[PDB]
Amino acid sequence: FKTHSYRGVDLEKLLEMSTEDFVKLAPARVRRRFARGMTSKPAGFMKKLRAAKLAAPENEKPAPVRTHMRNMIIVPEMIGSVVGIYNGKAFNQVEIRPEMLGHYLGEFSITYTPV
């Protein structure tokens, strides 16, 4: 068997890392997202991601958060977190990952039905 090494760059540091770090390693868009309208995104999610990941027993998933920030990023410290999102009415949750990392949040939440 051969684990998702995020850009092996050698999970190991893509498990539990800074916000300077992967600020750089995203694909062009995001440079112009951590650095633009930077403040006031997680005025209190990375501070309810850290109340969740953190009030569990771990391994029992944690007690669901709330959020309408479908405009946040997927970063290497929210790895596991649980997360639950406004499509305009209700909180659709999601498994949060190492291979969701660099990608858009609430792309994921699917809003509109299709057929």
DSSP states along 60-106: ----------TT----TT-S------BSSSSB-------S-------
Instruction: Pick one of 14, 26, 30, 65: the residue that binds RNA (CB under 7 A).
Output: 65
1/110 with CB nearer RNA? 110
Number of residues that bind RNA (CB under 7 A): 49
Site string for RNA, 6-45 (x = CB under 7 A): -------------x---------------------xxxxx
